């Protein structure tokens, strides 16, 4: 009854807590791991952002949720520049491979792309980008504080082109609230958002294993 933004936040609250408290991310943010582990995270993130942004491009071109799907949010290119700095060269592009979690995640994003599934893509968009614009700011700060990571290797978290972020988020939620969705599309979107958080928790679990 309070609009889609609120329903998404409430709907995914428990899944958010599970991802945030994963052993890998918990250890990362409290200073127990290192830049190597952060780097492995960001390499997996490059694979799934690449897939997410192909799906965004498809859905944006279809005409669905256009104002929400702001190209300033695109991360794949800044992320690759971060990885170039973290790894010291371009070597990582041909070394990295998708964890099992990331294979499932990418596969689903590729399904959304080729189906041009607007509702599903909005879900995935919200789970990643609003998180980047939220908890990601804390992540960036702790990578600097605990591990001495150069801010220039955290371009992913900076969102060049965006100034006031709370305002940006507020407007993001207004756009969510204003999307024209049938009951079936809204239900599909909410279920997808839970799956997005599920994939993201498993990315952390698989990083935790090796
Ligand atoms: C893959 C992991 C994560 C995902 C997908 C994610 C996603 C999200 C999303 C979608 C929101 C916006 C909720 C809304 O307003 O509707 C959010 C907010 C937030 N996240 Fe996360 N998050 C993740 C990890 C974390 C981490 C590890 C922390 C640790 C501090 C964290 C802290 C927060 C906080 C405090 C907010 C509220 C807004 C803010 O403080 O800026 N998140 N997150
Ligand atoms: O606020 C982020 C996100 O966390 C959740 C649980 O996923 O709420 C918890 O954290 C809040 C502070 O950030 C507390 O206020 C709240 O009471 C606690 O459950 C989500 O509800 C929220 O979207």
Work out the burial of residue 72: count CB atoms within 10 Å of its CB; fewer than 13 is exposed, 13-18 middle, 19 or more buried: exposed
Residue 2, classed as helix, strand or coil, is coil
Give the closest residue (by CA) to ligand 2 atom 8.
13
* C-alpha neighbours within 13 Å on the C-beta side of residue 40: 16
Residue 47 contacts residue 96 (beta carbons within 8 Å): yes
Per-residue CA distances from 82 to 44, 70, 99, 158 (Å): 13, 21, 20, 11
The residue among 1, 5, 2 whose CA lies nearest residue 127 is: 5
Residue 40 contacts residue 207 (beta carbons within 8 Å): yes
Structure tokens at 76: 């794949």
Query: What's the gap in Å between 124 CA and the centre of ligand 1?
Result: 14
Q: Where are the domains of the chain?
A: 1-210
Residue 116 contacts residue 207 (beta carbons within 8 Å): no
Q: Is 16 annotated as a binding residue?
A: yes
Structure tokens at 41: 């995270």
132 is catalytic: yes
Q: Give the experimental resolution in Å.
A: 1.9
Residues belonging to the chain: 210
Ligand 2: which atom is nearest the Cα of residue 14?
Answer: 7
Residue to probe by mutation, ligand 2, list 5, 9, 17, most atoms within 8 Å of CB: 17
Could you say which ligand is closest to the alpha carbon of residue 193?
A: 1
136 is catalytic: yes
Measure the CA–CA gap between 112 and 106, rounded to whole angstroms: 10
CATH class for the domain made up of 1-210? mainly alpha
Sequential DSSP letters for 106-138: HHHHHHHHHHT-HHHHHHHHIIIIIHHTTHHHH
CB of 27 closer than 6 angstroms to any ligand 1 atom: no
Place of tokens 């690449």: 50
CB of 16 closer than 6 angstroms to any ligand 2 atom: yes
Instruction: Return the DSSP state at 162.
Output: -
Residue 105: φ, ψ to 5°: -60, -55
């Amino acid at each position: 009854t309070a609009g889609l933004a609120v329903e998404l936040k409430q709907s995914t609250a428990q899944a958010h807590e599970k991802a945030e408290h994963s052993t890998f991310m918990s250890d990362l943010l409290k200073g127990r791991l290192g830049v190597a582990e952060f780097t492995r995270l960001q390499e997996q993130a490059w694979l799934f952002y690449t897939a997410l942004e192909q799906a965004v491009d498809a859905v944006r071109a279809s005409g669905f949720a256009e104002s929400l799907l702001d190209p300033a949010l695109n991360r794949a290119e800044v992320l690759a520049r971060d990885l170039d700095k973290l790894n010291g060269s371009s070597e990582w592009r041909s070394r990295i491979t998708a964890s099992p979690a990331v294979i499932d995640y990418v596969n689903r994003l590729e399904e959304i792309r080729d189906n041009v599934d607007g509702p599903a893509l909005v879900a995935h968009h919200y789970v990643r980008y609003l998180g980047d614009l939220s908890g990601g700011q804390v992540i960036a700060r702790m990578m600097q504080r605990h591990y001495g990571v150069d801010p220039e290797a955290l371009g992913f978290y900076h969102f060049e082109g965006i100034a006031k972020l709370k305002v940006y988020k507020d407007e993001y939620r207004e756009k969510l609230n204003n999307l024209e969705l049938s009951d079936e599309q809204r239900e599909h979107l909410l279920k997808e958002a839970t799956d997005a958080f599920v994939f993201n928790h498993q990315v952390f679990a698989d990083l935790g294993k090796g």
